[PDB]
């Protein structure tokens, strides 16, 4: 796939990354999985998030909600909508809270954003999570 | 952790397994992640699910739904409730449709079931998916 408008390349093999958590957004009618590279997953599990370490990459994968034919009360993934990424580099991405933001749309992997300044949209909401280093997700608890 | 009543041991390192899908069960008020070992993940991605191959292991992880303090419309994991497993061995588990079923409850990982016949409960529902080799989950679509 083409790079994002700010120059960020799509991380190869993100579909093999370990699970950090899951979510459902009522207003978007979607289901989401949150995965990370090994630096991200080690930080998540030890609570090294004030701040997240350089080299951590988070991905969020979104699907439209659909219902299971044999069990209609189970909400399950339908069409794939987007892959959203945050790349930690405190020096390189100082103007956007130390994070490099990027999104690719659909099974076609089309890069999102009108121009190289697109990540200001992402900051509009993610600045609300400034006390948690711009990340909303609380890693899911496991034994 | 202690073994299940049918003698199945808790699969070690399941939290490091690759993602097959996600779900939300309305009547249970939860969120779930579906992971698998590398035998199951190969079979899922290649469509080799008639039947699933011997050695495939599927896990479902469940959390109570909670809402994000900074974004109330985001439904997110709360307390960890259970880990559910299905281990494919067509010969060994021929009496339960070719799958070895087991559940461990909570952060303490307490084995579920009154006695060695507990998996007949699981079969009561999972026999509804008998045409799909007793598995409801459709692997989530990714590029
Ligand atoms: C989840 C997200 C993630 C995971 C990291 C995190 O902060 O939890 C990424 C990589 C990402 N987003 Fe953002 N996003 C928002 C909220 C509330 C959540 C948590 C709940 C859930 O699982 O859905 C997010 C909020 C918003 C938002 C407010 C309307 C906007 C405009 C955005 N996000 C925008 C972006 C991006 C701009 C292209 C981008 C690359 C994001 N998010 C990455
Ligand atoms: C999901 C499940 C999985 C993953 C494999 C699959 O079939 O998709 C495992 C390892 C497992 N269960 Fe079962 N379960 C049910 C349904 C509808 C789904 C798909 C939707 C979702 O993601 O939630 C399941 C249904 C039922 C059910 C009907 C009320 C019962 C009684 C059970 N499941 C019982 C069990 C087990 C008995 C202890 C067990 C080990 C299960 N499920 C494993």
Author numbering:
A (entry chain A), B (entry chain B): 19 to 161
Authors' text:
In M. capsulatus (Bath), two related β-sheet proteins (31% sequence identity) have been previously identified, a cytochrome P460 (McP460) and a cytochrome c′ (McCP-β)5,6 encoded by the CytL and CytS genes respectively. Cytochromes P460, defined by an unusual porphyrin-Lys cross link at the 13′ meso carbon, catalyse the oxidation of hydroxylamine (NH2OH) to form N2O under anaerobic conditions. High resolution crystal structures reveal a highly similar tertiary structure between the two proteins but major structural differences around the heme pocket consistent with a switch of function between hydroxylamine oxidation (P460) and NO binding/sequestration (cyt cp-β).
The crystal structure of as-isolated (ferric) McP460 was determined to 1.36 Å resolution with residues 19 to 161 observed in the electron density maps. McP460 exists as a homodimer, with each monomer consisting of a twisted five-stranded antiparallel β-sheet, two α-helices and two helical turns, Fig. 1A – a protein fold similar to that of NeP460 12 and NsALP460 13 from AOB. The defining P460 covalent cross-link is evident between Lys 78 and the 13′-meso carbon of the McP460 porphyrin ring. No hydroxyl modification of the porphyrin (observed at the 5′-meso carbon position in NeP460, but not in NsALP460) is evident in our McP460 structure. The proximal pocket of McP460 is also quite similar to that of NeP460 and NsALP460, a minor difference being that the His 144 ligand of McP460 is H-bonded to the Tyr 119 peptide carbonyl, whereas the His ligands of NeP460 and NsALP460 are H-bonded to a Met carbonyl.
